[PDB]
Write a protein that binds this ligand. Structure first.
Ligand SMILES: *[C@@H]1O[C@H](CO)[C@@H](O[C@@H]2O[C@H](CO)[C@@H](O)[C@H](O)[C@H]2NC(C)=O)[C@H](O)[C@H]1NC(C)=O
Ligand SMILES: *[C@@H]1O[C@H](CO)[C@@H](O[C@@H]2O[C@H](CO)[C@@H](O)[C@H](O)[C@H]2NC(C)=O)[C@H](O)[C@H]1NC(C)=O
Ligand SMILES: *[C@@H]1O[C@H](CO)[C@@H](O[C@@H]2O[C@H](CO)[C@@H](O)[C@H](O)[C@H]2NC(C)=O)[C@H](O)[C@H]1NC(C)=O
Ligand SMILES: *[C@@H]1O[C@H](CO)[C@@H](O[C@@H]2O[C@H](CO)[C@@H](O)[C@H](O)[C@H]2NC(C)=O)[C@H](O)[C@H]1NC(C)=O
Ligand SMILES: CC(=O)N[C@@H]1[C@@H](O)[C@H](O)[C@@H](CO)O[C@H]1O
Ligand SMILES: *[C@@H]1O[C@H](CO)[C@@H](O)[C@H](O)[C@H]1NC(C)=O
Ligand SMILES: *[C@@H]1O[C@H](CO)[C@@H](O)[C@H](O)[C@H]1NC(C)=O
Ligand SMILES: *[C@@H]1O[C@H](CO)[C@@H](O)[C@H](O)[C@H]1NC(C)=O
Ligand SMILES: *[C@@H]1O[C@H](CO)[C@@H](O)[C@H](O)[C@H]1NC(C)=O
Ligand SMILES: *[C@@H]1O[C@H](CO)[C@@H](O)[C@H](O)[C@H]1NC(C)=O
Ligand SMILES: *[C@@H]1O[C@H](CO)[C@@H](O)[C@H](O)[C@H]1NC(C)=O
Lengths: 311, 116, 211
C-alpha cells in the first residue's frame, strides 16, 4: 500500500503525496503484472493433463513397486511418502501477502494424474487417447528406444524390477538438496524485512515520524521536512519493485525449463543428452515440492566392460 | 487495523452490470444477500456452491465465478474430467484410425524503438 | 480451413504495444508535476523570481524529471530482455519446427509433429502446427513373445495381439495385422525366462514352397 507505506495514517500527508504524480499507480501496475504471471507459471508446469487419471486398486505392476511415489490413502493430504519429506525441509505497515490461486491439494492432483497416466499408458495419453499396454512391455519399448534389444528385459524382468525397487528406495535416505527452494523464500523475506526497516531512517530530516514534525514545527518548515522523508521512502519502493521484476524474470525462466522438462521427460522419452538425468533416459516421475517441482530421473547405465578385437 | 485492496469481479460489461467484490483477507464482520467467507478474504455478491466447473474468473485459492442461470457464482474449481484407464496385465489398446490436427502458436519478436 | 474461423488469440502481440504506449503516456504526464517546487514551468519561475532562488527551484524540477528518465530507461532494458528471450525461442522453433521434423514433446504443437508453416504477424510470428493424432482405439490381449519349437520369438518391430481366437503381429501406431512368420521375428533365448510367453504357431515360408 503506497500511501500507508510512505505517509502512514497521517492525512495531511495524503495531499502532499498527490503532488508527485502517478508514482503510486506505477507501483500497483508493476506488481500486478508479477502477481498474474506467478499463477500462470504454475499452470504451465503442472496443468498439462486434461483428465484426472487414477490407478487401479490392485496396484501391482508386474513387480515394480511404486508405493513411494503414489499417494498414501491413509492421510488427509493424500501426499506421497516422498512428497511428505519434500515439504518438511522448506503482516506489516501496508505490506500484504496474497494467497496462490491453486492450493497444494490441487497440485497434488495434477501430479497423481501424470503418474497414473504414465504407469498405465506410457506416453500415449499426451498425444491423444490413453492407450493401455502392460507396464513390463512399456519398459521393453523404452530399452528399444535407446538401442538395446528388447529381450534384455523380457528374460531379466525380475532382476530389473528388484534392482529398480532398491534404487528408488535409496532416494529417501539421501533426503532424510532443496536449497534452491529455500533461497526463493529467503530472497523475498529479506526484501520485505529491509523494506520495513527503511522506515526508521531520517534521510537528513529533523525526525523520521511525520506526526512528530508537526508537533514541534510550523507548516512552512514541516512541508519541507515531510517532503524529504516522502522522497526517501518513495525511492525505497522504486528499489523494491525494480528488483521484484528482475527476480521474477529468473523464476519465470525456471518455470519455462520445468514446463519443458515436464513435457519432454515425463510425457515422452528424450534423446537430449543430460536433459533428463545422467545416463540413458528411460523414464521420469514428477513429485510436488513447495514452490517447485522434483523430477525422479530413471536412467540406463552400462557396467562391467570387456575388451575385444574388432574389424 | 484491518485493510487491503478492493477489487470488483465483473462478468463483462457487455453482458451485464452486476459485480461482486472481494475484500482481501478482510473478515465479513469488519467490512462496513450472498456473503461467503473464504480463507482468501470476504466475498460479497456471489453464492458459493459445492459443485465444480472450469475456471472462469479466477478469484484465488481454488475459487472462481461466472454468469450462471443471470447471476454470479463462486465455487471450488474442478481440475478436469475424471477418467480411469482400463489397465490390466495382458490388455493393450491400439488405434485403428487417425486425424490430422492444426494448432496455432504465437510469439512476439520485437518492440517499437524509442528515443528521448 | 477451420483456422480462419477461430480468428475472424493475438493478445500477446497487443500487450507489447500496450506496454510501450503506457510508458510513453506516463513519461509525458510526469512533466506536469511540481515535486514540491513553487511551479512546474521553468520559464514561469524566472518571470516571478530572482536567480538566487530560481536556480534552487529549477534544480528540484531537473532532479525530478531526471529520475523519470532513469525509471523509463531501466524498465526498457528489463523488458527488452524478455522480448529478446521470446525472439530466441521463435528463432529456435523456426529452425526446429519449420526447417525440420522434431521429436521434442510439445515443442511443435500437440500431437505427433509432422510439419509447420510460418505466417507473419505484426511484431511477431505465427506457427501453423500440423500434427498426427491417433483415434478410435480397440483393446486386445497381448504377450511379449511366442514359443515355437521350444524357442522364444520376439517381434522385430510391433506388438503381438489377439483378436479372441488368433494371434497377429501389428505395428504400434496403426492397427494392421500380419501373420507371424520367421521373417517378421527374431529368436533369442528359450521359453523359460520370459514371463507371460504364450504358445502359437510361427509359419516358415520355406516348407510350403518345397511342398
Ligand atoms: C513396496 O515397498 C514398501 C516399502 O517401501 C513395502 O512396504 C513395506 O513392506 C515391509 C515388508 O516387506 C514391511 O515391513 C513394511 O512395514 C512396509 N511398509 C509400509 C509403509 O507398509 C510394500 O510391501 C511394497 N509393495 C509390494 C507389493 O511389494
Ligand atoms: C477413418 O475415419 C474417417 C472419418 O474421419 C472415415 O472416412 C469416412 O467414412 C465414411 C463411411 O464410414 C464416409 O461416409 C465418409 O465420407 C468418410 N470421410 C471422409 C472424410 O472421407 C474412414 O472410413 C475411417 N476408417 C475406418 C477404417 O473406419
Ligand atoms: C479373428 O480373425 C480371424 C481371421 O479373420 C477369424 O477367423 C476366421 O479365419 C478363417 C481362416 O482361418 C477365415 O476364413 C474366416 O473368414 C475367419 N472368420 C472371420 C469371422 O473373420 C476369427 O473369426 C477372428 N476372431 C474373432 C473372435 O473375431
Ligand atoms: C506350450 O507348449 C509347450 C510345448 O508343448 C508346453 O510344454 C509342455 O508342458 C506340459 C505341461 O503343461 C508338459 O507335460 C510337457 O512335457 C511340455 N512339453 C515339452 C515339449 O516340454 C507348455 O506347457 C505349453 N504352455 C501352455 C501354457 O499350455
Ligand atoms: C475396468 C474399467 O475401467 N472398465 C470400464 C468400465 O468401467 C466402463 O463402464 C466401460 C465403458 O466406458 O469401459 C470399461
Ligand atoms: C582392456 O585392455 C586395456 C589394455 O589394452 C586395459 O587397460 C583395460 O583395463 C582392459 N579392460 C578390461 C575391462 O579389462
Ligand atoms: C459483445 O458486443 C460486441 C459488440 O459491441 C460483439 O461484437 C460481441 O460479439 C459481443 N460479445 C458477446 C460474447 O456476445
Ligand atoms: C470473523 O469473525 C467471527 C467472529 O466475529 C469469526 O467467527 C469468524 O471465524 C471470522 N472470520 C474469519 C475469516 O476469520
Ligand atoms: C458443501 O459440503 C460440505 C461438506 O463437504 C457441507 O458442510 C456444506 O454445507 C456444503 N455446502 C453447501 C452450500 O451445501
Ligand atoms: C477396453 O476395455 C476396458 C475394460 O477392460 C474398457 O473400459 C474400455 O472402454 C475398452 N476400450 C474400448 C475402445 O472399448
Ligand atoms: C494377471 O492377473 C490375474 C489376477 O488379477 C492373474 O489371474 C493372471 O494370471 C495374471 N496374468 C499374468 C500374465 O500374470
Amino acid at each position: 500500500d503506497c500511501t500507508m507505506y510512505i505517509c502512514g495514517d497521517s492525512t495531511e500527508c495524503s495531499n502532499l503525496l498527490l503532488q508527485y504524480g502517478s508514482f503510486c499507480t506505477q507501483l500497483k501496475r508493476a506488481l500486478t503484472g508479477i502477481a498474474v504471471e506467478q499463477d500462470k507459471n504454475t499452470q504451465e508446469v503442472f496443468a498439462q493433463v486434461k483428465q484426472i487419471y487414477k490407478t487401479p486398486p490392485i496396484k501391482y505392476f508386474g513387480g515394480f513397486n511404486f508405493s513411494q511415489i503414489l499417494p498414501d490413502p491413509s492421510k488427509p493430504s493424500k501426499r506421497s511418502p516422498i512428497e511428505d519429506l519434500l515439504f518438511n525441509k522448506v503482516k506489516f505497515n501496508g505490506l500484504t501477502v496474497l494467497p496462490p490461486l491453486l492450493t497444494d491439494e490441487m497440485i497434488a492432483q495434477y501430479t497423481s494424474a501424470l503418474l497414473a497416466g504414465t504407469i498405465t499408458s506410457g506416453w500415449t495419453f499426451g498425444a491423444g487417447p490413453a492407450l493401455q499396454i502392460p507396464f513390463p512391455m512399456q519398459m521393453a519399448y523404452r530399452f528399444n528406444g535407446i538401442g538395446v534389444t528388447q529381450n534384455v528385459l523380457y528374460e531379466n524382468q525380475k532382476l530389473i524390477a528388484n534392482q529398480f525397487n532398491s534404487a528408488i528406495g535409496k532416494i529417501q535416505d539421501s533426503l532424510s538438496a532443496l536449497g534452491k527452494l529455500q533461497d526463493v523464500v529467503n530472497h523475498n523475506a529479506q526484501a520485505l524485512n529491509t523494506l520495513v526497516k527503511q522506515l526508521s531512517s531520517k534521510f537528513g530530516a529533523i525526525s523520521s515520524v511525520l506526526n512528530d514534525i508537526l508537533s514541534r514545527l510550523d507548516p512552512p518548515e514541516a512541508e519541507v521536512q515531510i517532503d524529504r522523508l516522502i522522497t526517501g521512502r518513495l525511492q525505497s519502493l522504486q528499489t523494491y519493485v525494480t528488483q521484484q521484476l528482475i527476480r521474477a524474470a529468473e523464476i519465470r525462466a525456471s518455470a519455462n525449463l520445468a514446463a519443458t522438462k515436464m513435457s519432454e521427460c515425463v510425457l515422452g522419452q528424450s534423446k537430449r543428452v543430460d536433459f533428463c538425468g545422467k545416463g540413458y533416459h528411460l523414464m521420469s516421475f514428477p513429485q510436488s515440492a513447495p514452490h517447485g517441482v522434483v523430477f525422479l530421473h530413471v536412467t540406463y547405465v552400462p557396467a562391467q566392460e570387456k575388451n575385444f578385437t574388432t574389424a | 487495523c484491518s485493510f487491503g485492496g478492493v477489487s470488483v469481479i465483473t462478468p463483462g460489461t457487455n453482458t451485464s452490470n452486476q459485480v461482486a467484490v472481494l475484500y482481501q483477507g478482510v473478515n465479513c464482520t469488519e467490512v462496513p444477500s450472498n456473503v461467503f467467507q473464504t480463507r482468501a478474504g470476504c466475498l460479497i455478491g456471489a453464492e458459493y456452491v459445492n459443485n465444480s466447473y472450469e475456471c472462469d474468473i479466477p478469484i484465488g485459492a481454488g475459487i472462481c465465478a461466472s454468469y450462471q442461470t443471470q447471476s454470479i457464482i463462486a465455487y471450488t474449481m474442478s481440475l478436469g474430467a475424471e477418467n480411469s484407464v482400463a489397465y490390466s496385465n495382458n490388455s493393450i489398446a491400439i488405434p485403428t484410425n487417425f486425424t490430422i490436427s492444426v494448432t496455432t502458436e504465437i510469439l512476439p519478436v520485437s518492440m517499437t524503438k524509442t528515443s528521448v | 480451413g477451420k483456422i480462419q474461423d477461430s480468428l475472424s488469440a493475438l493478445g500477446k502481440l497487443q500487450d507489447v504495444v500496450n506496454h510501450n504506449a503506457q510508458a510513453l503516456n506516463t513519461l509525458v504526464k510526469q512533466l506536469s508535476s511540481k515535486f514540491g517546487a513553487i511551479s512546474s514551468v521553468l520559464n514561469d519561475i524566472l518571470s516571478r523570481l530572482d536567480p538566487p532562488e530560481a536556480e534552487v527551484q529549477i534544480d528540484r524540477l531537473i532532479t525530478g524529471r531526471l529520475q523519470s528518465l532513469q525509471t523509463y530507461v531501466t524498465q526498457q532494458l528489463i523488458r527488452a530482455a524478455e522480448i529478446r528471450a521470446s525472439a530466441n525461442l521463435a528463432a529456435t522453433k523456426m529452425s526446429e519446427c519449420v526447417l525440420g521434423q522434431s521429436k521434442r514433446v510439445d515443442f511443435c504443437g500437440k500431437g505427433y509433429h509432422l510439419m509447420s508453416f510460418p505466417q507473419s504477424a505484426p511484431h511477431g510470428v505465427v506457427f501453423l502446427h500440423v500434427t498426427y493424432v491417433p483415434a478410435q482405439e480397440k483393446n486386445f490381449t497381448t504377450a511379449p513373445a511366442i514359443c515355437h519349437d521350444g524357442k522364444a520369438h520376439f517381434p522385430r518391430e510391433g506388438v503381438f495381439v489377439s483378436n479372441g481366437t488368433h494371434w497377429f503381429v501389428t505395428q504400434r501406431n496403426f492397427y494392421e495385422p500380419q501373420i507371424i512368420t520367421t521373417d517378421n521375428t527374431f529368436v533369442s533365448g528359450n521359453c523359460d525366462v520370459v514371463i507371460g510367453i504364450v504358445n502359437n504357431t510361427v509359419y516358415d515360408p520355406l516348407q510350403p514352397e518345397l511342398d
